[PDB]
Amino acid sequence: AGTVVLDDVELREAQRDYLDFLDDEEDQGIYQSKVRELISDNQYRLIVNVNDLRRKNEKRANRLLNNAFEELVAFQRALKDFVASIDATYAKQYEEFYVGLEGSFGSKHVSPRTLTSCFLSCVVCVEGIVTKCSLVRPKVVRSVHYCPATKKTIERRYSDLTTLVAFPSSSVYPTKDEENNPLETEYGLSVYKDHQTITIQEMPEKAPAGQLPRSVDVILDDDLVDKAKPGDRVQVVGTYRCLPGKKGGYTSGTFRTVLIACNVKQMSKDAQPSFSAEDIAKIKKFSKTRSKDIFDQLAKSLAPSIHGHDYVKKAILCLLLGGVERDLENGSHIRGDINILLIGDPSVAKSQLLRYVLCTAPRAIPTTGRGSSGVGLTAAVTTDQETGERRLEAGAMVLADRGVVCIDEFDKMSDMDRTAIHEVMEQGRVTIAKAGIHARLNARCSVLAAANPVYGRYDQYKTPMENIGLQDSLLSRFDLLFIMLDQMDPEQDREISDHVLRMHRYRAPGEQDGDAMPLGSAVDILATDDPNFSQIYEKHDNLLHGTKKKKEKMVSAAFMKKYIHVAKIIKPVLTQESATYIAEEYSRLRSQDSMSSDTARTSPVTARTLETLIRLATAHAKARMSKTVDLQDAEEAVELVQYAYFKKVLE
Amino acid sequence: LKDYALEKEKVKKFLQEFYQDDELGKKQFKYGNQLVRLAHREQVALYVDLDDVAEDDPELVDSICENARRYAKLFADAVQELLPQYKEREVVNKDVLDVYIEHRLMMEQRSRDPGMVRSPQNQYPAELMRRFELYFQGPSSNKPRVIREVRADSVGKLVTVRGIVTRVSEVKPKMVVATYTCDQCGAETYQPIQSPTFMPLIMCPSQECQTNRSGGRLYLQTRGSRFIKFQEMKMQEHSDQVPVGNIPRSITVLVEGENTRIAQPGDHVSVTGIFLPILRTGFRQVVQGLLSETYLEAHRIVKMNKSEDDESGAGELTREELRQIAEEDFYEKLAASIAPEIYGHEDVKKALLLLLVGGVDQSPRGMKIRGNINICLMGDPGVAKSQLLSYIDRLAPRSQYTTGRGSSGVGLTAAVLRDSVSGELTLEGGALVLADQGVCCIDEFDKMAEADRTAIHEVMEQQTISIAKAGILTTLNARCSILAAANPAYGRYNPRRSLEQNIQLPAALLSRFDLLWLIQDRPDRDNDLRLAQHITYVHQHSRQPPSQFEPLDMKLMRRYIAMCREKQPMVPESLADYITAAYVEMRREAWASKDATYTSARTLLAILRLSTALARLRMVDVVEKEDVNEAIRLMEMSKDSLL
DNA sequence: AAAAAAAAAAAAAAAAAAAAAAAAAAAAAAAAAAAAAAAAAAAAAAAAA
DNA sequence: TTTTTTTTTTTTTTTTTTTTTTTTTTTTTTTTTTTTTTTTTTTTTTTTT
Ligand SMILES: Nc1ncnc2c1ncn2[C@@H]1O[C@H](COP(=O)(O)OP(=O)(O)OP(=O)(O)O)[C@@H](O)[C@H]1O
Ligand SMILES: Nc1ncnc2c1ncn2[C@@H]1O[C@H](COP(=O)(O)OP(=O)(O)OP(=O)(O)O)[C@@H](O)[C@H]1O
Ligand SMILES: [Mg+2]
Ligand SMILES: [Mg+2]
Ligand SMILES: [Zn+2]
């Protein structure tokens, strides 16, 4: 039976509502702009915030979240109409324009555990971690055939009956003419869309402790396919649906369910920030107005809750900004990443600096001394066990590519692990091979490590070599080494205890009202949106209980994030005055007679020390947004290296 | 949409009257000559450069690159129709398949009945009687694609990708047309094979067995059938074209015919071919729809950028390269061109060039002495050991780079792994096998597993790998020269301890190395300032500071080294006493001192193969005394840092 | 001219074969998946001056 | 920091069950339609005094 719907009142109302929501030109044209923008950069999926739809038309919003395919096909018809109105040529260039969904899903925000059968055919938001991706396969959507006998060319379309009943006539691939003349397929004239299945598991830190994990199968269709890789924490929005079984004759009543993605997104910490023109204006104002002391303003504003360690904070800012990688014509490579090691007495807030960089930096990976063991730290090679083939698995330092590995308790890490990270800490790559596969994975990361000295506490009366239990090969590739020392000076105690007690009295405005306790318990998280994939920004923090009062402000965390993102892209070029100063500075550093007696070397001075002078000067110039590495930048680099590389041995 | 008779006339016209001045400026018909050559069965592969097609019909090149399988068939049709009129003699029947083609053609003529219209099935399939095979060379106006980004939108299109070959099956016969004979009739039955599997036919369809309504069971046979050399490889994304947090993606390349036996695992290649699907029917498919696997049907496979090929057969070059090779400072110029961004280490670079060139292998009365030079850079932290090793890896034609323990165990040796074409257990080599006749750069040699150090013993001297474990019982074949990098015993040379107590290598392994170089960096104002100026210039301009001689491009270095490689020189008798005296003197001073490494007959053999390499760099056929002098001098400079 | 006849000749009903149409219609076997457990090689951390 | 036993732990498989999928498959009645009879109701050529 083949009928057509002459009049579907519901479809008419739905399409009219969706086109009305999209036209948007009277209401500050946000989706008008979004559609012109997807036309511009040659996409065909429009990501629609359901909060905007809920504002403009709440009845559509409920219908769409609750009847996902009917409403989504209506909304994609409306979107194709809108694109054709804006541009008919682009609209005809694509057969289908898809709508992805975004925003706040009230009870439709689930995990693979709470995604139950009361959600079939509803739009849901599921968060989890990718356990297995499949290969990206093409699925034929339109097959073209040529008969050499009769010179005829035919074409046969295949509808997406992934979650609908498929009758066997729907999937017959034509091989013969009606006269039983052999057909031959035109592969370049046929249309294939690519297809991928992933499995999303409940995140290990969100699942109930001690229970086995729950997963959901997810279907990804064209332009959504390579969006996730195993081990990614993603958010998938799609329709939850029951897959058809194979034509049987007996059914057990059981259906495989699946999520048909309409949008996939990563952790929003690692995404390109949105930059309003006012933000770029503010950044330019900041950089131009304060240029000499902008670096110190950013540095002392780094971890405000940590008092002191101003040189450590300058170095950590340099790590957050980085040098510039050299890519020579013959393929030779020089790293622009800064590696920092903190060795110190117990409880001097070095685990806190590691954690701050974890919170702030994009693509920061945590690890502890024995939580990662070789293969878990760099890559791994396993066998697929279902295809028999070698498979590469990214470890911590590959996942931290263009990011930071924050290794804590670095000293308690085994010796083989540190040997393993030697090659990453200098070449920014992991060379891995079993016999069937060999690879050279990119791990362009900066390492921020915290260690404790031998004997637990630093001994003021012993050489830093005898007190840091690491060898010159490992130390030398840590381009800044800071001995964070617990001196029990009473005025220093005044300062620190005041700051600490002042941080233990602050209540967050509004949220806290006098006696509140923060915790929520395993439901309150899914009650509201995740602040990990969620979508006016000042420059300085207003005065508060964090600081008493003075004539020097505190850069806002959000503004600092935007500023550092902008400045990290800069590639300041070393000038000749800087080059001469750095060269002579390094030559002076190497010669020990310049440095006093009773002063030992924390780490050796090698050509790596020269490279790090260059890297630190470049990062400083990035902070000023200079585009040139001037003499002030070189001086700041040299003074940081001078502070770090020498320690006074007492007696 | 378009008419393929007209397209066939277009491609015929291209093949017949395209000309170029390639033959020394003489105007040749580029493809008519090849039609002659493969009409006389002196050639199998016809590589149709699409740049040539684009000179006079870019719309045709667009059509080709958009369907690319219709047009491969069209080009094969057109050349098959053009061959009879390019045949100027009678083929000598060099093959056994040729006899079958000739007998089939002669029988068809014999029972011709030219005016009688025979059934469409009563004919020879085209593929059964071709003997040639036609391939495209992608237009250069097509920018190469990245393996990750070759997706469903490019199915059926001609694309060019480049990556490392990770895995190649063995060449094995793929059935193209299955031939059957009957037990009743005397006709042959042909079954062209397109799928990865086929059901063999049972009953014959010939005219006689239909007239007689006889049983007519047919029998599949290899003798009349058409096979093609088939080979499946896996190719992998290059490192500098992978997204940030990702691992490289593979693609299956199906290589058949004359493109087989080009790529070996470890090769950097550029593959031109059609991205094509394999129906993937059969599974308990979760999803309804015609899902399929993908592969690149290889048309042109080109090794490149470290494993460049054609230059080897193109040793003839400009008069320039004649004049530089003739020059006396050629050895110094080649040594200086090794990693020009690294400052200093002039003698280290000379030794590295010797390792690249290598000595001559001897095979006297069944007792093999290998000409490989093995070098260990035993150095302080941050003296550019890893940079030199990484450079040598990027330079040498068959080079694998290995750091501490990512490539340990079977990552150096072989392993047995399942295949797919036959489903049995194939043996896959690791770094020492992937570098079988090249260099294996072992970084962090001192932090290497003891099992791997033992394997390196047996590789370095016997140039094999003996495995007698459970799944594997083989002697692999590992003719590589080992370039090792290590730190002294405690990460830095300690002058208060003895030389071997710093090296921390046993005498046996220390003797495995023809040149073991100590690299200490004592500070000093002048040299540190010069090193800093070099390094800061490299940072400033992404190049080394200019010097008197421009360093050779890595292509020229490869060509010069390769041209040196086939220059086996002989040690003359007139040098026997000089070499023996040098060895004896070296041997005596080894135990006269109290700070000397183990010395043995291997020290003589090191002198001898180093001097052979030096003679080879001068393109001479006998070793002179200056080569032995340079070998001696490099052997002292290896430990000069101790002073 | 009408009066018996004595046929057509139309209808209803029957037969009466054809020749086409219509109507009935689960259980047995297999394979794949996912899970286990087991021989082997391989990679860790306790031993001592 | 050279040697050395538990420990896994990734890889080979094998089992192995449970579940979903796969594979197999004419005969027999009924009915309409056509072409025949057959009793009965006319009706159209026969003749007389
Ligand atoms: N200078 C400081 N400013 C603010 N807080 C501090 C400071 N020093 C220590 N603290 C407090 O001490 C507590 C412990 O700090 P943390 O855990 O970072 O110590 P640590 O240096 O990592 O110790 P260990 O080396 O033993 O791991 C933190 O809560 C931190 O707030
Ligand atoms: N002589 C030199 N010329 C140029 N660059 C140098 C030189 N020595 C060191 N460098 C620079 O120092 C950096 C460190 O070099 P590299 O990693 O090769 O040291 P290494 O010898 O491997 O040390 P280790 O023994 O610790 O592995 C490189 O980026 C290199 O460019
Ligand atoms: Mg801590
Ligand atoms: Mg190194
Ligand atoms: Zn027959």
Side-chain angles (χ1 to χ4, degrees), chain A, chain B residues 1-22 24-25 27-643:
Chain A
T3 71
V4 300
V5 186
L6 277 181
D7 192 59
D8 204 311
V9 176
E10 299 282 344
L11 182 63
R12 257 192 307 113
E13 314 294 339
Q15 178 143 0
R16 188 196 63 242
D17 285 356
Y18 285 133
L19 189 47
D20 175 30
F21 158 85
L22 280 181
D23 275 7
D24 207 60
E25 183 43 58
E26 286 76 16
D27 291 15
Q28 72 257 11
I30 62 170
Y31 281 101
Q32 182 69 251
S33 64
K34 272 165 184 192
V35 176
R36 291 190 296 271
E37 191 277 331
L38 65 84
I39 291 182
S40 83
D41 57 0
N42 189 359
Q43 317 273 278
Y44 50 107
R45 186 177 296 267
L46 167 79
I47 304 302
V48 163
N49 200 306
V50 304
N51 302 343
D52 310 340
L53 182 59
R54 210 179 282 120
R55 264 186 290 278
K56 270 224 197 177
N57 193 324
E58 209 200 4
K59 190 214 164 304
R60 288 293 92 194
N62 289 336
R63 281 275 296 272
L64 164 78
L65 295 189
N66 278 284
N67 207 6
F69 289 184
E70 289 79 357
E71 297 300 305
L72 268 184
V73 67
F75 186 25
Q76 291 171 6
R77 293 181 184 271
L79 173 60
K80 201 160 154 65
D81 280 339
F82 191 56
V83 175
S85 80
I86 290 185
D87 181 6
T89 78
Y90 191 81
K92 64 90 176 179
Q93 199 268 324
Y94 286 104
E95 178 77 27
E96 182 65 26
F97 283 86
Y98 308 97
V99 162
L101 294 176
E102 205 180 18
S104 180
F105 306 81
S107 54
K108 272 78 172 175
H109 176 235
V110 298
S111 74
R113 179 175 301 269
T114 53
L115 183 56
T116 62
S117 165
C118 66
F119 291 112
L120 274 299
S121 88
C122 306
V123 161
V124 302
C125 195
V126 194
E127 293 177 352
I129 192 163
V130 194
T131 50
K132 41 183 196 168
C133 292
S134 89
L135 289 180
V136 178
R137 271 70 170 264
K139 161 173 163 198
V140 61
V141 300
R142 188 140 62 69
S143 82
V144 168
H145 311 271
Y146 177 66
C147 190
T150 70
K151 324 283 185 271
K152 264 185 56 197
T153 287
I154 70 166
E155 172 190 78
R156 188 267 183 275
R157 288 160 191 270
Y158 308 88
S159 46
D160 176 31
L161 317 163
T162 177
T163 54
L164 306 161
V165 54
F167 302 99
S169 82
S170 312
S171 158
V172 56
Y173 192 87
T175 54
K176 294 293 178 181
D177 186 74
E178 294 83 3
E179 303 286 319
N180 279 328
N181 282 318
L183 262 51
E184 54 197 13
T185 180
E186 305 289 315
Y187 298 103
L189 306 185
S190 311
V191 188
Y192 303 78
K193 73 159 197 49
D194 45 28
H195 173 261
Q196 189 173 5
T197 304
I198 73 182
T199 287
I200 282 296
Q201 191 204 287
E202 192 183 12
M203 293 180 183
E205 77 268 359
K206 303 259 197 304
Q211 288 192 239
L212 287 183
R214 300 284 177 79
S215 298
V216 59
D217 291 334
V218 175
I219 303 283
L220 311 167
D221 279 318
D222 54 337
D223 78 3
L224 283 180
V225 287
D226 268 334
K227 293 275 192 264
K229 57 166 176 298
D232 297 1
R233 297 175 155 83
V234 307
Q235 204 193 53
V236 179
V237 179
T239 307
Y240 194 45
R241 281 192 94 67
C242 291
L243 280 168
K246 283 253 169 55
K247 163 70 159 75
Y250 202 86
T251 191
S252 60
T254 289
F255 291 100
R256 298 185 317 290
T257 66
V258 70
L259 189 65
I260 297 89
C262 76
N263 194 28
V264 182
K265 46 174 49 171
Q266 298 291 322
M267 282 282 210
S268 82
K269 204 160 69 88
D270 304 332
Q272 180 66 40
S274 52
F275 278 107
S276 49
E278 50 262 27
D279 284 317
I280 304 180
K282 286 171 175 295
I283 280 151
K284 288 183 55 70
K285 181 174 72 68
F286 196 63
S287 63
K288 181 63 70 177
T289 55
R290 291 190 179 177
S291 187
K292 290 297 292 184
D293 53 342
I294 190 167
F295 186 79
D296 311 341
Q297 178 87 250
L298 284 171
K300 66 178 72 66
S301 164
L302 215 49
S305 314
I306 311 301
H307 173 260
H309 306 125
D310 304 294
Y311 280 117
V312 183
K313 282 169 154 187
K314 272 170 259 179
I316 289 187
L317 176 62
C318 288
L319 177 140
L320 291 184
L321 278 168
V324 174
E325 270 176 11
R326 312 304 173 197
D327 286 320
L328 312 193
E329 286 95 340
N330 55 349
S332 295
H333 180 244
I334 301 170
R335 68 175 168 92
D337 293 280
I338 294 90
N339 300 316
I340 291 155
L341 173 57
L342 320 179
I343 306 98
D345 295 315
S347 168
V348 299
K350 72 177 90 73
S351 296
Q352 283 300 317
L353 294 169
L354 275 286
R355 295 286 168 180
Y356 170 74
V357 178
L358 280 169
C359 295
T360 296
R363 282 173 306 274
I365 303 296
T367 179
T368 306
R370 283 160 100 100
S372 299
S373 186
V375 160
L377 199 54
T378 77
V381 180
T382 58
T383 312
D384 209 355
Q385 184 177 2
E386 74 191 16
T387 74
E389 293 179 354
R390 307 284 212 206
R391 162 188 44 225
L392 299 159
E393 213 158 347
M397 294 178 71
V398 171
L399 302 169
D401 194 40
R402 300 315 200 190
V404 191
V405 188
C406 290
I407 309 173
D408 198 359
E409 318 277 8
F410 185 74
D411 64 284
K412 303 165 176 71
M413 198 190 221
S414 83
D415 280 271
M416 293 177 70
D417 287 328
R418 301 190 285 243
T419 290
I421 73 179
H422 281 173
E423 192 254 330
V424 194
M425 278 181 60
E426 182 70 59
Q427 268 90 60
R429 68 190 194 184
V430 179
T431 293
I432 193 66
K434 296 298 112 180
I437 202 183
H438 68 288
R440 201 160 56 62
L441 310 198
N442 292 306
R444 282 80 52 90
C445 64
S446 50
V447 177
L448 179 67
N452 274 288
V454 191
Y455 324 120
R457 293 180 181 177
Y458 195 98
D459 200 352
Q460 318 269 12
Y461 304 91
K462 301 187 118 177
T463 288
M465 206 192 288
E466 201 203 3
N467 210 17
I468 309 155
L470 304 172
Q471 44 200 12
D472 273 13
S473 65
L474 179 58
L475 292 186
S476 71
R477 68 182 66 251
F478 272 120
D479 54 53
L480 279 181
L481 183 147
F482 290 98
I483 287 152
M484 293 177 70
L485 188 63
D486 194 0
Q487 295 277 17
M488 295 200 254
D489 188 84
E491 195 48 50
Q492 183 62 255
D493 270 341
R494 298 293 296 164
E495 306 287 322
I496 301 175
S497 60
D498 191 24
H499 180 100
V500 164
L501 288 162
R502 209 162 69 247
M503 295 297 172
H504 277 290
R505 301 200 292 116
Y506 161 82
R507 320 275 317 197
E511 314 174 349
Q512 271 72 359
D513 55 349
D515 55 300
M517 185 64 73
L519 189 46
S521 52
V523 55
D524 309 333
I525 295 90
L526 287 195
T528 77
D529 275 351
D530 207 333
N532 282 117
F533 314 88
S534 179
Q535 303 100 43
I536 307 164
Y537 308 87
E538 216 57 44
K539 186 180 289 293
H540 293 100
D541 273 323
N542 54 340
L543 183 63
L544 183 62
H545 203 178
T547 45
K548 65 180 178 66
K549 182 59 179 177
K550 44 206 188 310
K551 294 95 169 183
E552 190 275 332
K553 291 166 279 190
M554 185 64 72
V555 191
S556 171
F559 173 76
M560 185 180 288
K561 164 171 309 193
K562 281 180 197 292
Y563 183 86
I564 278 177
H565 179 97
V566 179
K568 184 180 250 292
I569 299 158
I570 314 292
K571 299 205 171 304
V573 58
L574 203 64
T575 80
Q576 192 45 244
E577 56 174 2
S578 295
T580 53
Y581 178 65
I582 284 170
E584 60 191 11
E585 284 310 308
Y586 163 75
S587 82
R588 191 262 297 160
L589 269 156
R590 286 269 272 173
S591 72
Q592 61 84 25
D593 43 11
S594 179
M595 283 73 74
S596 303
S597 174
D598 81 13
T599 312
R601 253 168 178 87
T602 73
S603 55
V605 181
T606 61
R608 272 178 192 129
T609 302
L610 174 75
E611 303 263 23
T612 197
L613 287 170
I614 288 147
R615 263 186 297 267
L616 296 166
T618 306
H620 193 265
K622 264 183 216 207
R624 318 189 285 98
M625 281 186 164
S626 172
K627 291 174 70 175
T628 49
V629 179
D630 301 333
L631 191 70
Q632 51 174 345
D633 309 308
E635 289 161 346
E636 180 80 48
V638 167
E639 91 181 9
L640 214 66
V641 160
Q642 189 75 51
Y643 180 83
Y645 274 62
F646 299 97
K647 198 65 168 47
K648 297 296 289 183
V649 174
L650 302 173
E651 166 49 54
Chain B
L1 174 79
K2 63 165 62 88
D3 189 58
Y4 292 134
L6 303 188
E7 309 289 310
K8 204 200 273 189
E9 292 317 297
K10 269 206 275 187
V11 302
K12 261 172 186 165
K13 182 175 73 175
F14 164 77
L15 291 160
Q16 282 173 169
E17 61 264 18
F18 171 86
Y19 52 87
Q20 262 183 356
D21 293 331
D22 310 321
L24 322 168
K27 191 202 90 159
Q28 306 274 38
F29 286 144
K30 183 175 182 179
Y31 297 97
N33 294 345
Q34 286 158 345
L35 294 203
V36 174
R37 292 199 68 235
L38 61 93
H40 307 145
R41 279 281 301 129
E42 311 166 67
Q43 174 184 345
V44 176
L46 183 82
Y47 291 96
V48 173
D49 207 340
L50 291 186
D51 282 312
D52 305 349
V53 186
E55 287 187 24
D56 51 287
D57 207 352
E59 315 294 329
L60 188 62
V61 169
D62 283 4
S63 286
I64 287 179
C65 292
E66 284 304 275
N67 217 353
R69 196 98 187 287
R70 166 69 43 198
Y71 280 90
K73 280 182 281 184
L74 271 179
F75 265 82
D77 280 319
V79 61
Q80 184 172 24
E81 296 162 26
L82 296 187
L83 286 198
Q85 75 188 7
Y86 280 86
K87 201 185 59 62
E88 307 150 359
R89 41 191 187 80
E90 207 264 330
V91 176
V92 309
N93 262 8
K94 38 184 62 57
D95 213 321
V96 173
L97 277 296
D98 285 322
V99 187
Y100 265 90
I101 284 181
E102 176 193 10
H103 287 190
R104 291 177 176 137
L105 284 182
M106 159 194 69
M107 283 300 137
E108 210 184 19
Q109 282 289 87
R110 195 170 288 183
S111 170
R112 188 91 258 180
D113 293 334
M116 156 171 171
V117 54
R118 45 170 72 233
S119 180
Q121 308 319 314
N122 197 322
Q123 53 167 356
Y124 302 132
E127 314 84 13
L128 182 79
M129 293 177 71
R130 283 254 167 89
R131 291 329 299 278
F132 68 87
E133 59 192 4
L134 188 150
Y135 298 121
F136 292 128
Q137 272 168 313
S140 290
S141 78
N142 278 6
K143 181 267 290 180
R145 298 188 64 113
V146 183
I147 291 172
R148 194 173 313 254
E149 301 176 359
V150 184
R151 283 146 169 245
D153 74 324
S154 75
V155 171
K157 326 289 188 291
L158 185 85
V159 308
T160 292
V161 286
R162 46 198 57 170
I164 298 92
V165 181
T166 44
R167 175 163 211 218
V168 193
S169 77
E170 294 294 328
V171 177
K172 46 191 68 179
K174 198 185 90 185
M175 177 80 69
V176 185
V177 190
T179 298
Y180 307 80
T181 53
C182 167
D183 57 355
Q184 301 287 157
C185 70
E188 279 184 331
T189 303
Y190 316 111
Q191 185 191 11
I193 310 301
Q194 315 280 169
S195 296
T197 80
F198 66 100
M199 182 66 98
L201 312 165
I202 301 171
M203 300 295 270
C204 69
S206 67
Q207 183 61 65
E208 274 210 8
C209 279
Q210 298 315 115
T211 297
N212 297 327
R213 277 150 275 287
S214 61
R217 276 88 156 272
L218 60 82
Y219 295 72
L220 172 61
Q221 52 187 31
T222 57
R223 179 66 91 165
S225 310
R226 277 305 299 259
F227 297 91
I228 192 171
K229 293 189 267 271
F230 173 76
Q231 198 173 12
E232 179 200 358
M233 66 182 180
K234 293 293 292 183
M235 182 179 72
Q236 192 181 248
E237 272 179 323
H238 270 103
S239 188
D240 63 358
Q241 65 183 177
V242 174
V244 293
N246 272 104
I247 70 170
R249 184 136 311 157
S250 287
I251 188 168
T252 300
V253 192
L254 288 192
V255 191
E256 74 195 17
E258 283 304 319
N259 293 313
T260 58
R261 285 186 192 100
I262 297 169
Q264 293 82 17
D267 285 357
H268 297 203
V269 296
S270 171
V271 181
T272 296
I274 304 102
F275 197 48
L276 284 168
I278 307 178
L279 176 52
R280 198 192 187 272
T281 195
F283 292 159
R284 300 290 214 271
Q285 46 166 2
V286 175
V287 170
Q288 288 151 344
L290 296 167
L291 209 70
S292 72
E293 322 272 5
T294 47
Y295 70 105
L296 195 69
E297 162 183 297
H299 272 215
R300 184 80 178 178
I301 297 169
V302 173
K303 295 177 192 169
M304 66 182 180
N305 208 2
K306 174 175 91 161
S307 44
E308 285 151 343
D309 202 345
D310 63 344
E311 285 97 357
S312 302
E316 60 274 15
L317 269 168
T318 75
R319 172 64 166 82
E320 280 67 17
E321 65 91 16
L322 277 296
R323 88 166 161 263
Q324 293 82 18
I325 184 53
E327 266 193 0
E328 69 275 16
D329 49 343
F330 173 69
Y331 162 57
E332 283 78 9
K333 289 199 215 302
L334 265 192
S337 291
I338 281 172
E341 68 271 355
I342 294 89
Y343 166 90
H345 300 316
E346 308 89 1
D347 297 307
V348 161
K349 289 165 182 180
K350 289 173 181 300
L352 290 183
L353 173 70
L354 292 199
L355 183 149
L356 286 161
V357 159
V360 169
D361 305 288
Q362 308 298 321
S363 45
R365 293 179 293 173
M367 183 278 288
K368 293 187 286 185
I369 314 155
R370 85 293 188 279
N372 288 93
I373 297 89
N374 308 326
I375 296 170
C376 190
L377 310 181
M378 185 64 72
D380 273 335
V383 301
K385 293 181 309 280
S386 315
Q387 297 279 313
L388 291 175
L389 261 67
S390 197
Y391 184 88
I392 289 307
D393 179 28
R394 291 191 321 265
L395 174 58
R398 287 183 63 86
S399 46
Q400 287 299 318
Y401 180 75
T402 296
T403 312
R405 282 191 213 225
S407 314
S408 60
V410 304
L412 287 165
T413 296
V416 165
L417 183 63
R418 172 195 194 186
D419 208 345
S420 71
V421 294
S422 296
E424 66 182 1
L425 298 172
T426 73
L427 199 60
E428 311 274 315
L432 293 173
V433 175
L434 294 184
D436 180 22
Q437 268 174 334
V439 189
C440 195
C441 311
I442 315 293
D443 217 353
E444 320 288 341
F445 190 72
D446 58 310
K447 292 171 263 282
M448 203 195 189
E450 196 44 41
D452 300 336
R453 261 154 170 256
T454 300
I456 288 302
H457 280 62
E458 190 276 331
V459 159
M460 279 175 109
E461 267 311 311
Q462 298 333 113
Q463 276 185 336
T464 43
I465 305 179
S466 292
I467 313 161
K469 298 187 198 302
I472 298 89
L473 188 153
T474 71
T475 295
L476 305 156
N477 193 0
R479 280 82 59 87
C480 56
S481 58
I482 301 308
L483 177 51
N487 280 119
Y490 290 121
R492 171 176 288 277
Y493 193 85
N494 189 1
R496 312 279 100 201
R497 277 209 317 271
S498 62
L499 178 58
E500 81 169 5
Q501 209 172 2
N502 274 310
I503 294 173
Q504 207 54 75
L505 286 189
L509 196 52
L510 166 61
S511 86
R512 296 312 166 99
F513 283 103
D514 301 290
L515 274 182
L516 188 153
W517 213 273
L518 276 296
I519 312 168
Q520 315 198 39
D521 50 345
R522 283 82 58 84
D524 69 308
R525 287 278 198 153
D526 291 331
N527 174 82
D528 286 347
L529 193 58
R530 289 197 301 279
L531 174 65
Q533 284 153 14
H534 176 104
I535 291 188
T536 197
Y537 189 99
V538 167
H539 272 258
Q540 184 170 353
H541 295 102
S542 183
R543 299 179 68 262
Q544 72 287 339
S547 66
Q548 70 276 17
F549 313 133
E550 201 87 348
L552 313 186
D553 205 79
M554 185 179 288
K555 274 191 62 171
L556 294 174
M557 311 189 45
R558 286 190 220 112
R559 259 214 312 290
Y560 280 160
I561 293 161
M563 182 179 72
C564 286
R565 297 292 298 273
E566 65 267 12
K567 208 67 183 172
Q568 276 98 26
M570 294 298 102
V571 180
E573 290 79 345
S574 56
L575 289 174
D577 291 331
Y578 186 67
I579 297 177
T580 290
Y583 164 59
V584 162
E585 190 276 331
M586 185 180 288
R587 190 75 185 274
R588 298 294 296 163
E589 314 307 327
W591 47 78
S593 158
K594 269 75 57 179
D595 199 65
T597 73
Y598 182 79
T599 188
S600 46
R602 279 182 188 132
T603 302
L604 186 151
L605 295 164
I607 302 169
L608 206 47
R609 65 179 54 110
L610 283 163
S611 63
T612 291
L614 285 155
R616 197 190 258 185
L617 274 164
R618 299 179 298 114
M619 311 279 204
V620 302
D621 313 329
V622 302
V623 187
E624 272 75 14
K625 190 166 292 181
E626 65 182 1
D627 314 325
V628 186
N629 282 345
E630 183 68 14
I632 299 306
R633 195 204 53 95
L634 279 173
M635 287 180 93
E636 283 101 13
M637 287 312 105
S638 68
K639 311 292 198 301
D640 198 58
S641 288
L642 294 174
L643 318 180

